[PDB]
């Protein structure tokens, strides 16, 4: 009757967006270009041109409608009441790994993109030559650090 879990399990036939546009084929070239750098959940089967929710969009299922950024649309499925919400330190979802690594035993931040042409910047980023590197404070950063404490 109603779809649960933001329609992440949903196996239906719907192939038209709320704006009556026809879903492009998930297997299509232009749809694959757009999928190329995205983070898709395997338990979500990209069948044909059917409204699916691969990325776990809070808004539910959707499909591409054409080949440029932003050319997609949600599909009007009837979802369930699902009474819960995320607050400023709540919503997770796996981010900045590959396959639960763990091994990182000569550094304790875990910096990310690999050193070839990722390019360079990483080890030192976010430390200012005229401030952190000189041991000087800028005139208003104290305001920021104090907001953490009280």
């Amino acid at each position: 009757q109603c779809v649960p879990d933001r329609g992440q399990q949903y196996q239906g036939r719907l192939a038209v967006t709320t704006h009556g546009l026809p879903c492009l084929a998930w297997a299509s070239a232009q749809a694959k270009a757009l999928s190329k750098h995205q983070d898709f959940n395997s338990a979500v089967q990209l069948v044909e041109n059917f409204c699916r929710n691969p990325d776990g969009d809070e808004e539910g299922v959707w499909c591409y409608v054409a080949g440029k950024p932003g050319d997609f649309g949600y599909c009007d499925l009837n979802y369930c009441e699902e009474a819960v919400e995320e607050e400023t330190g709540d919503g997770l979802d796996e981010d900045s790994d590959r396959a639960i690594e763990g091994r990182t035993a000569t550094s304790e931040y875990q910096t990310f993109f690999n050193p070839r042409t990722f390019g360079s910047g990483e080890a030192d980023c976010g430390l200012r030559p005229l401030f952190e590197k000189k041991s000087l404070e800028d005139k208003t950063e104290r305001e920021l650090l104090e907001s953490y404490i009280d």
């Binding site: 932003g70 607050e87 400023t88 981010d95 005229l130 208003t140 920021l144």
Partner: protein, 251 residues
């Protein structure tokens, strides 16, 4: 930036100005995340409702700047663009969900006292810093008031992160997990906001654990500037970090 102050020299060395070749014109801000990649807001490059669609040859990135208008030869570096990547699901038709873009520079740039990249958050940094009440800093050369004042020099303002239910109720526009909001509440006394022309610029937080500056947001959108009961909205950078890494690694 409304109700901000002039930046100090080298205070935000990752700040980038995106600039139209012809006619010569500031478009937006941006941030340097490495020697050859720049982060910005997608709507600075692509917003069909305003007939806006800039390609690589239309634009310049200018790094190390302070003056809005002066050509700061020997301090600033001007780089051409190799490639633009707009988030494939940047939702311009609705609410600017996933308002983010990456730009690859023609050649890497050398760092200096004035030119230096910002860090991107890890999950742990994002979890501890991204909380209501905590302040981050926003910079840019955008309007000084809702009803324009262009600044002569880079502006900076410190603003607190706002609870999500308060963000949600402040606007009719649909807010998502890919955004957060910041600014003072009416009856908190202090004022401040980003404005048009500031889009793309970084919302940054200085970590108490390692003292590095992390870019947590990108100036995205708002309704006016500095209105009571309204808050600026920022692209949640961590929540789109996987897309950032994938674009960069697959290059």
């Amino acid at each position: 930036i409304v109700e901000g102050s002039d930046a100090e020299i080298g205070m935000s060395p990752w700040q980038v100005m995106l600039f139209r070749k012809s006619p010569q014109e500031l478009l937006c801000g941006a941030s340097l995340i490495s020697d050859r990649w720049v982060l910005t807001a997608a709507h600075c490059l692509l917003y069909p409702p305003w007939d806006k669609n800039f390609t690589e040859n239309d634009l310049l990135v200018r790094i190390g700047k302070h003056s809005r208008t002066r050509y700061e030869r020997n301090i600033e570096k001007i780089s051409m663009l190799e490639k633009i990547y707009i988030h494939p699901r940047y939702n311009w038709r609705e609410n600017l969900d996933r308002d983010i873009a990456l730009m690859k520079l023609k050649k890497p740039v050398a760092f200096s006292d004035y030119i230096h990249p910002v860090c991107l958050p890890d999950r742990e940094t994002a979890a501890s810093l991204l909380q209501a009440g905590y302040k981050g800093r926003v910079t840019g050369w955008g309007n000084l008031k809702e009803t324009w004042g262009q600044p002569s020099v880079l502006q900076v303002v410190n603003l607190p992160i706002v609870e999500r239910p308060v963000c949600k109720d402040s606007t009719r526009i649909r807010i998502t997990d890919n955004m957060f909001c910041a600014g003072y509440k009416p009856d908190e006394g202090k004022r401040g906001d980003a404005c048009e022309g500031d889009s793309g610029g970084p919302f940054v937080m200085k970590s108490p654990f390692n003292n590095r500056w992390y870019q947590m947001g990108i100036v995205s959108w708002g309704e006016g500037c500095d209105r009571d009961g309204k808050y600026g909205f920022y692209t949640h950078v961590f929540r789109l970090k996987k897309w950032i890494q994938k674009v960069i690694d697959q290059f």
